[PDB]
Amino acid sequence: AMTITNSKAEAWELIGNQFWTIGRVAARPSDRENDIFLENIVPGSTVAVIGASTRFLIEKALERGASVTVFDFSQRMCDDLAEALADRCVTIDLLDITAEIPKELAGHFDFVLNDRLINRFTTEEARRACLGMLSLVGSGTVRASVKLGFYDIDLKLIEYGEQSGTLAKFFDPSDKTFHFREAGDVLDRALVPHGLIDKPTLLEWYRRRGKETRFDDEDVRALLSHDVVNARGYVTLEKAVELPDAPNTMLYQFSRR
């Protein structure tokens, strides 16, 4: 019942294992990218993955010898993941990274990884999230990739919502936040192929997904330097790398010590 405080979790009850079985292939890290997420991580390391959907990244983490805990705010996601890994030794917990971290977990991980999870946030949600990741790692490293600029669907959203003159109703240009459930009829028209998941399932997933903010590189930097994220010590961006396969996707490694 943390789905009361965060109704976005409802969006992922809809999807479950479909995300990595029939979802858009490019919407998860490639083999190479799993490897980049994991560099200099060695057997024995404690690693937290936020997003139980990143099933193959989690599986390379375990194969590498790391002690992996997965966090996700959706019960089905946890359940389908625990099913796919029933033979492996791994901890899977129900948690909302934008909620305040349980004290029993502060500074408990060497690494916190997530792939394009920040894209599932609004700006104030993403600020809270980054704080949570930092809270988890204590003096460890956070590696978080972010997809930059607009999604293909965004381009249909602008177009088909301009012609309709509804664009301002569901898109805020101040920080580039979309409200999908509020484009109404435009959403249906703009939907693009996400692997082999069908239109009814997409539409609903989008509608349940709430608001989402789009980021440019300057936007991710502004987020990381924001007072809310530095409220408990100052943050350091150690590096930022443009990923090979994924779509204009920058991976950011940061910490606060």
Ligand X SMILES: C[S@@+](CC[C@H](N)C(=O)[O-])C[C@H]1O[C@@H](n2cnc3c(N)ncnc32)[C@H](O)[C@@H]1O
Cβ 121 to ligand X, closest distance in Å?
Answer: 7
Instruction: Select 95 or 186, whichever has its Cβ closest to ligand X.
Output: 95
93 is in an annotated binding site: no
Output the smallest distance, CB 159 to ligand X, in A.
25
Between residues 69 and 98, which has the closer beta carbon with respect to ligand X? 98
Structure tokens at 149: 């600029």
97 known ligand binder? yes
The least CB distance from residue 46 to ligand X, in Å, is 18
Least distance (Å) between residue 168 CB and ligand X: 27
Q: Is 50 annotated as a binding residue?
A: no
**CB < 8 Å & 24+ apart, contacts of 83-92:** 83/17, 84/17, 84/55, 85/55, 85/58, 85/59, 88/59, 88/62, 89/62, 90/58, 90/62, 92/52
CA 147/CA 35 separation, integer angstroms: 18
Note the maximum CA span of the chain: 56
* Residue with Cβ nearer ligand X (142 or 186): 142
Q: Are 252 and 216 in contact (CB under 8 A)?
A: no
Residues of the shown chain interacting with ligand X in the complex, contacts defined by CB under 6 A: 8, 12, 19, 27-28, 50-54, 71-74, 77, 95-98, 114-117, 120
Please identify the residue of the shown chain whose CB is closest to the bound ligand X: 51
Cβ contacts of 1-10, under 8 Å, gap ≥ 24: 2/73, 2/94, 2/96, 2/99, 3/73, 5/96, 5/99, 6/73, 6/96, 6/98, 6/99, 7/208, 7/210, 8/73, 8/120, 8/208, 8/209, 8/210, 9/73, 9/74, 9/75, 9/96, 10/208
72 labeled binding residue: yes
Name which of 120 and 214 has its Cβ closer to ligand X.
120
Q: Considering the complex, state which of residue 110 and residue 115 has its C-beta at the smaller distance from ligand X.
A: 115
In angstroms, give the least distance from the CB of 207 to ligand X: 16
Q: Binding site for S-adenosyl-L-methionine: which residues?
A: 53, 72-73, 96-97
Q: Binding site: which residues?
A: 53, 72-73, 96-97
